[PDB]
Amino acid sequence: ALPDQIDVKVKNLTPEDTIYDRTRQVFYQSNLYKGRIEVYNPKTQSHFNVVIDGASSNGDGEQQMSGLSLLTHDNSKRLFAVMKNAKSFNFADQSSHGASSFHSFNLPLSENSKPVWSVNFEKVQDEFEKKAGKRPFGVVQSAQDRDGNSYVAFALGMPAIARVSADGKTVSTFAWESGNGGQRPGYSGITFDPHSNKLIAFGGPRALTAFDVSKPYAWPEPVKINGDFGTLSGTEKIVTVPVGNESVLVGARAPYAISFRSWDNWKSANIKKTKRSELQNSGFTAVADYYQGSEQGLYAVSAFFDNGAHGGRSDYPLYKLDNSIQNFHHHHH
Ligand SMILES: [Cl-]
């Protein structure tokens, strides 16, 4: 059976994001403060890191590792790394003009891996502000379409999504909308659904917002929730879980993992929830999948932000979530 927890024993990791590579049997995990990717083998417990020249640090760098994503679920050829500015979410010393960046890597990763390409968001931030009136900042997650284009969510300032071409040459303003106030008015997550061929952003102005990927820009498409999502406060990252021939999206809103399933290509979605008490105050930001052979489960990713950069924590548990959230019934029958 799958374990109730996977205890990652890496000191001062702060895994703001974590994703599993089923093919390679490793997790790719943020190291927030050091601005690097940590690669953890849960079977052997071995780990190593991938540093990014000019961005990684000893814990006090300007840029920090947030989101990680795979090109495809299986046999992924590439991994994408979002780096936010260290001051974006420092609400006592906040900036909307810091350096931030995005990197494409070939898989498999090794200690000496370097990006295929890298971009930064300064110019696109200026363009968003010029056209919409507010400067977005706080890059938190990206999603890749079938052709390898990336769509990067901004959580702060205003709701905004930057597109980065598959070849890294063009960073563009893809989508945006007005915010409705608050410290975190933008999208807290984004994921891609290969079945509908849509992006779905989590949080901000509403629970879920869909976008088509076929054109240079996209209008936000509000998703009607067939149920009661609840508060928008505290939403984090959202992921796509393949369940048979379908997609179930799973978002974090501590202490809940909240899942979604659509039968109409994201015009609407049904909703399920689960929670665990450990996730009340663990820095729960994301859900990861995990496999041992053909056995699959979902695990909560907890950053433990209360540690800071050097607080000494050396246990980063990933906690198993109830499978109820990945079992939808459209309807008795
Ligand atoms: Cl940022």
Side-chain angles (χ1 to χ4, degrees):
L2 291 174
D4 189 61
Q5 72 173 262
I6 301 170
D7 185 13
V8 177
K9 296 175 182 170
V10 174
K11 183 175 156 187
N12 295 323
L13 177 59
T14 317
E16 166 146 342
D17 206 3
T18 288
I19 62 176
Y20 189 64
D21 185 332
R22 181 185 181 179
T23 304
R24 303 187 177 80
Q25 304 175 354
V26 293
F27 290 101
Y28 309 122
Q29 308 190 270
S30 302
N31 183 316
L32 183 74
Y33 288 100
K34 297 193 176 285
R36 66 191 186 195
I37 303 168
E38 180 263 334
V39 183
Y40 184 71
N41 186 307
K43 185 184 186 184
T44 65
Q45 308 169 45
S46 70
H47 58 96
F48 65 92
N49 308 128
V50 179
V51 298
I52 297 181
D53 181 42
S56 301
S57 73
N58 297 141
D60 195 39
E62 55 169 15
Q63 298 191 62
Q64 296 182 333
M65 192 64 68
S66 64
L68 297 169
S69 62
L70 300 177
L71 186 52
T72 60
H73 188 272
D74 299 336
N75 298 109
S76 190
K77 299 179 176 171
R78 293 198 171 182
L79 165 153
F80 299 82
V82 180
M83 304 194 69
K84 66 181 183 185
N85 194 264
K87 298 189 189 203
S88 294
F89 294 85
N90 187 341
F91 298 94
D93 186 23
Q94 195 185 54
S95 181
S96 64
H97 287 80
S100 64
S101 65
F102 184 62
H103 312 271
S104 179
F105 287 87
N106 287 325
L107 294 177
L109 291 181
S110 290
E111 186 179 335
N112 68 331
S113 284
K114 304 172 181 174
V116 175
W117 50 251
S118 303
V119 298
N120 72 71
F121 295 112
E122 194 282 326
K123 180 178 177 43
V124 84
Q125 289 174 279
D126 291 344
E127 289 176 347
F128 281 121
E129 183 175 357
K130 184 66 167 184
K131 297 190 294 199
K134 295 207 187 316
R135 190 178 189 79
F137 63 113
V139 291
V140 288
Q141 195 173 19
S142 80
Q144 287 65 51
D145 69 18
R146 297 168 172 161
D147 293 330
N149 305 301
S150 296
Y151 306 86
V152 182
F154 292 75
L156 308 177
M158 55 165 216
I161 300 166
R163 181 188 189 278
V164 184
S165 61
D167 67 15
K169 287 289 193 200
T170 311
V171 181
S172 62
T173 57
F174 169 77
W176 66 91
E177 61 180 310
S178 300
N180 302 137
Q183 285 188 1
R184 303 169 184 243
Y187 307 122
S188 65
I190 193 170
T191 199
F192 179 67
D193 174 16
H195 293 297
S196 63
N197 202 35
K198 295 210 176 231
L199 294 158
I200 311 86
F202 187 44
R206 66 192 64 83
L208 294 181
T209 308
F211 306 84
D212 292 315
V213 297
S214 61
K215 291 178 192 187
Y217 304 95
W219 303 113
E221 301 162 23
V223 181
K224 185 185 274 195
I225 305 300
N226 307 315
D228 188 356
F229 180 78
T231 190
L232 304 173
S233 184
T235 63
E236 292 286 355
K237 306 185 195 300
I238 192 166
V239 299
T240 305
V241 179
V243 182
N245 58 115
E246 305 293 354
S247 294
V248 169
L249 312 183
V250 185
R253 191 196 68 208
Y256 294 94
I258 304 175
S259 63
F260 307 91
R261 169 74 170 104
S262 180
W263 290 260
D264 59 15
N265 294 316
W266 302 99
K267 289 166 183 275
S268 71
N270 287 16
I271 183 168
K272 300 182 77 178
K273 303 180 177 160
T274 191
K275 64 176 173 198
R276 274 186 81 131
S277 61
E278 298 95 332
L279 305 176
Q280 294 163 1
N281 291 291
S282 62
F284 171 38
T285 51
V287 176
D289 68 357
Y290 178 64
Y291 294 77
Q292 287 180 355
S294 60
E295 292 192 355
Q296 183 267 22
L298 297 180
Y299 288 76
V301 181
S302 290
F304 298 92
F305 298 111
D306 67 333
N307 190 65
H310 303 286
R313 174 169 285 269
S314 60
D315 296 89
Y316 288 87
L318 299 170
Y319 289 108
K320 195 177 197 301
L321 294 162
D322 196 316
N323 283 324
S324 59
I325 61 167
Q326 32 178 0
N327 310 320
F328 282 75
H329 296 306
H330 201 3
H331 305 289
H332 304 89
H333 323 247

